[PDB]
Amino acid sequence: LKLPTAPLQLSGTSAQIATLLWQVAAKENQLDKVQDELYQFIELFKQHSELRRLATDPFVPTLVRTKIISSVLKDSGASEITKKLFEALADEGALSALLEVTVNYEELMLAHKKEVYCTVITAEPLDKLERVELTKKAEKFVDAGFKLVMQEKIDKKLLGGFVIEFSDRRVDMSTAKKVEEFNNFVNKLVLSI
């Protein structure tokens, strides 16, 4: 009854299913063994129009759907967590929730490697000493030991500096915003002084 804590809290009814799936896969040390199974079943829904019929057609009975899903996965070289998950999603016709359980499982998994996806906007193409110093300041905007998956991008309307877009927060350490906050600082003191 003791389950390992998920790395981050998430939404309802399609993210808590993935949270529970991560919680029971971390108990069996079986995270990367079921993540590729999620991707494989996404490819299986891409392949056959008779396997995504079980997810979208509302006229197949739940007995027929559960008997296709159970009698197709006869241990299939696969994890038992995946087989006990898909016959559970087949008992409600909730097989369409797989394509968002995979998204929230990807979020939990790349939060499991403390990795952080972000994009960086600069004015110039970076040097490899300018790059390794950018990661010295970007790591202080993460409150853990998360070693990021920083990419690069160029837009020279910035007057030098960097803008780190963490996909949920922005850190605008560009000089073009500094010279605008400089002008907005000296335009309000001279109205009072």
Partner: peptide, 29 residues
């Protein structure tokens, strides 16, 4: 284009997580 039909799930059984958790915790050995 074949996965556009599954880009948002719609189902009954508001307590779906209970029926998934009554199948997933016995998958643990």
């Amino acid at each position: 284009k074949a996965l556009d039909e599954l880009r948002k799930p719609k189902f009954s059984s508001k307590y779906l997580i209970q029926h998934v958790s009554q199948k997933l915790i016995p998958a643990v050995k």
